[PDB]
Amino acid sequence: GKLSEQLKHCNGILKELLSKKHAAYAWPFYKPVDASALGLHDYHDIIKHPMDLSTVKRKMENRDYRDAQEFAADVRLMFSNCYKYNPPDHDVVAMARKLQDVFEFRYAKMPD
Numbered sequence: 279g280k281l282s283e284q285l286k287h288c289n290g291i292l293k294e295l296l297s298k299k300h301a302a303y304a305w306p307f308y309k310p311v312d313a314s315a316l317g318l319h320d321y322h323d324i325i326k327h328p329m330d331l332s333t334v335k336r337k338m339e340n341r342d343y344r345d346a347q348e349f350a351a352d353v354r355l356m357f358s359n360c361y362k363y364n365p366p367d368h369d370v371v372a373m374a375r376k377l378q379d380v381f382e383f384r385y386a387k388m389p390d
């Protein structure tokens with residue numbers, strides 16, 4: 279009921295984050311970090327709980343999220359992992375912040 283409706287809002291946000299109008303800055307978050315492929319041989323020493331939008335999408339499709347808060351927690355974990363790993367002046371941090379602005383402003387419109 280209310281929870282289904284809230285997760286519908288989450289699915290709409292997720293669709294938007296994956297949409298072409300944000301693709302120029304959303305792309306680092308589309309898939310799990312392949313640390314070896316990117317040469318980030320310290321990534322898994324620093325980041326204990328990787329997260330990315332394709333994993334959020336699979337969990338949404340599979341009904342893993344019991345409420346909107348767990349969905350939001352995973353999206354914020356993905357952004358926090360990016361802020362944890364990188365210097366504050368890094369290009370990817372600016373990209374994360376722009377996509378997080380999109381996320382937080384629409385998440386705040388949650389029906390209640």
Ligand SMILES: COc1cc(C(=O)N2CCC(N3CCN(C)CC3)CC2)ccc1Nc1ncc2c(n1)N(C)c1ccccc1C(=O)N2C
Nearest residue numbers: 301302305306307309310311312316318359360363364370
């Ligand atoms: C698998 O996704 C990646 C692709 C590429 C790559 O080959 N590119 C970059 C994007 C470009 N596309 C852009 C969109 N366009 C529609 C199609 C073409 C094509 C050329 C480069 C990196 C990719 N993955 C990626 N994962 C996690 C990172 C990270 N980078 N950012 C940039 C980081 C960089 C350094 C240190 C940390 C990170 C990081 O935090 N994340 C989340």
Ligand SMILES: COc1cc(C(=O)N2CCC(N3CCN(C)CC3)CC2)ccc1Nc1ncc2c(n1)N(C)c1ccccc1C(=O)N2C
Nearest residue numbers: 301302303305306312314315316317318368369370372373
């Ligand atoms: C480590 O970070 C990057 C790496 C590469 C790259 O050449 N790769 C990484 C992906 C590729 N792997 C794929 C799988 N395979 C096993 C082999 C390894 C190997 C070659 C390319 C881009 C990287 N980071 C990056 N950050 C911000 C951008 C930007 N570019 N530019 C290029 C953009 C490209 C498209 C749209 C926007 C941007 C952009 O604005 N920024 C700021």
